Write a protein that binds this ligand. Structure first.
Ligand code: NAP
Ligand code: NAP
Ligand code: A1EDR
Lengths: 354, 354
């Protein structure tokens, strides 16, 4: 009844390149009106995600506005025409805030370069989640990154027995999940991680290879490693990097190769905006590049297919999806800085329980 | 069975960039052994093609060897196990030679940048060709260039009623062929030409807009021309140029767009090897670029479907595909140089009746 005090991380200052996490965000205590519309709801946050692509959303965020992010919430209060009743556990884009008010409807990301539209709020069912498939997973293998990997692999990539596969950024959850289904469909999987230790992790997961981009800073050194990592060329490629790794990949594309472009760390974070033209290398191969935007998939029928196919496999230990959950609402911008600095200590999907 | 005297245009000198035709080719007279293998044939040449991709075939061809090219041939004498009997009209890569011997089996072009294998020799069936679809068109609409355009449009691109479509290099036969098939599928077709007339010529063909790259050297000057020619963004794009023009397209790709990359005149001829990284422009669009290499379609099943589909449209004038047939064996390299120029006589497929 009335109002309540919440806390938000809000954009203090726009800073390009690798984020200066403690200089860009600022915690503030905001008063939130708890008088609700016909279809609004009051939500408490239980978990938030922190992903490298928040780096872009930050640059498009107006100063002072809370930093958006993928989150798990719980309905505290609900309007009369509310999409969800109280208690309901939902997954959505509540951002870095302890509380918030929302109609839950799909809304337009007006400030974007591209007119993005955050989906509506997915209702969650506790029954699906248990000790082995925790509720914390609706942000990973049972949430965003898992939809991205499973989708690319059922809806776009026909992986065949005998394919060489390259997964740039294989360390993260999406990279690792992609590689697993790659091997699962009987495919030589090659990866990239950044520390010798992370290397063994993937290597323990079935990665027939890993590579240190840290020690392969020019596309030349990289082609070298790659020709050896993939002695039979490249059949499929799930890219989240670009710039030098990708320039080398395209130079060995088998015929009928598929490429899925999921992100471009090189261009986005490290700001490599000019490079060698890759389009001329795809013609003779008849490669098929596709841009990935996993939101195109957040259909109700689609979420079930993930639980149904992915959910089982995961709980039978057959499919690995670790999640590294840091505690405390206040450490959120610091968890965000680990993706760009202390990621060697990170294993799987980074989250924060609030 | 003795010998015979022939004439060949042979690669005298490699010159990258725009070809210097009278400096690169040298007419020569070679004597040909008239003893045939088990599956070989003696071939007299009737017509030859001249295409811009011959700029590449030239640069990989060893100095002194005949210039390969698309041709129409006729069996003079044939071994016992020949794929075709004498008198038969065959279509293959006989190059700029008055005569030649060949078994017609597929052969490998190893000295290339990419290790291609020229297809097997096609027999031409007179029933297909008539006054209105002359035998010469098996080098144009009824041969390679038509297969490329028809393939890309039946096998890859779903154009819908109401799509904007872009065609780089829209002047040539494939581009003009492509734009036309688009217009039939209810598609606003936008093109690029080099002369006020060539632009009108396309406009006469159904092109809802045209733009002069001759004026638009900057992706910025281009984006502007483009943003206005394609006010609703780009739904499909048939690329044969690249560089500044493609840079401008990717900056306005609609959602679900398809791209067919067929050639890169800019990269190939104009040597534009580095430019802005385009992959960041395909993720939100969920663009689906595919490289085009029409050779994958050289099946009998397909050639019949081409004649059956394209031949009809063409003979009822619903589909226009002019051919500028220059006569005379000696005039071949000069007929080649008509591309690479501001000739309004460069209308349709350039050929040489020998
Ligand atoms: N397109 C879409 O619709 C969509 C949807 C969701 C996510 N995504 C994106 O897809 C990616 C995968 O997600 P995730 O959760 O698994 O992220 P993630 O892989 O954990 O992202 C950070 C990781 O990337 C690696 N990395 C950093 N710089 C690198 C470089 N120069 N070369 C190679 N690897 C480098 C590091 O691995 P090491 O620790 O081994 O260095 C680090 O741990 C993310 O970028 C995410 O934003 C896209
Ligand atoms: N991948 C495959 O399997 C495959 C198969 C066959 C052909 N191809 C290639 O695809 C291309 C299309 O064939 P085509 O018969 O239609 O050739 P074409 O377009 O007639 O080739 C020359 C024409 O391109 C134009 N041009 C030159 N520079 C340009 C620029 N900067 N911007 C825009 N247009 C420019 C000129 O048109 P204006 O006269 O208006 O200036 C010129 O007349 C050829 O290069 C061919 O080699 C590929
Ligand atoms: C319910 C949450 C859902 C996420 C919400 C937003 C995320 C978008 C981030 C956008 C960044 C941006 O525009 N930055 C500036 C442009 C740079 C660059 N260009 C791109 O086209 C691009 C991308 O497509 C990036 C896609 C990420 C997809 C994410 C969604 C998946 C899903 C889990 C880039 O990042």
């Amino acid at each position: 009844l009335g109002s309540m005090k919440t806390e938000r991380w809000v954009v203090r200052e726009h800073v390009e390149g690798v984020p200066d996490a403690a200089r860009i965000y600022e915690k503030v205590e905001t008063e939130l009106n708890t008088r609700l519309g016909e279809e609004q709801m009051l939500l408490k946050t239980l978990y938030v995600s922190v992903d490298p692509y928040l780096q872009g959303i930050c640059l498009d965020t107006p100063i002072g506005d809370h930093m958006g992010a993928d989150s798990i919430m719980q309905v505290l209060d609900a309007g009369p025409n509310a999409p969800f009743r109280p208690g309901d556990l939902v997954q959505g884009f509540g951002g870095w805030r302890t509380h918030l008010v929302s109609d839950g409807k799909p809304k337009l990301w007006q400030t974007g370069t591209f007119p993005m539209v955050f989906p509506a709020y997915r209702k969650l069912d506790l029954r699906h989640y248990d000790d082995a498939l925790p509720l914390s997973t609706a942000l990973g293998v049972m949430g965003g990154p898992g939809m991205t990997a499973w989708g690319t692999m059922t809806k776009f990539m026909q992986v065949r027995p005998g394919d060489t596969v390259v997964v740039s950024g294989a360390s993260g959850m999406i990279g690792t999940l992609v590689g697993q289904m790659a091997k699962r469909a009987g495919a030589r999987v090659v990866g990239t991680a950044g520390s010798a230790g992370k290397a063994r992790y993937l290597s323990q997961l079935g990665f027939d290879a890993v590579i240190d981009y840290k020690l392969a800073d020019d596309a030349d050194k990289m082609r070298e490693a790659l020709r050896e990592a993939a002695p039979d060329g490249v059949d499929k490629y799930f890219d989240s990097i670009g710039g030098s790794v990708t320039d080398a990949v395209f130079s060995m594309l088998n015929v009928g190769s598929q490429v899925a472009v999921c992100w471009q760390w090189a261009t986005q974070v490290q700001r490599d905006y000019h490079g060698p033209r890759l389009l001329p290398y795809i013609m003779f191969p008849r490669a098929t590049i596709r841009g990935i935007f996993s939101l195109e998939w957040f259909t109700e029928q689609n979420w079930s297919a993930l639980h149904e196919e992915l959910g089982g496999l995961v709980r039978r230990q057959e499919l690995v999806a670790h999640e590294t959950v840091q505690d405390g609402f206040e450490h959120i911008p610091a968890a965000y800085q680990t993706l760009f600095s202390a990621s060697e200590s990170n294993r799987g999907k980074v989250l924060v329980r609030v």
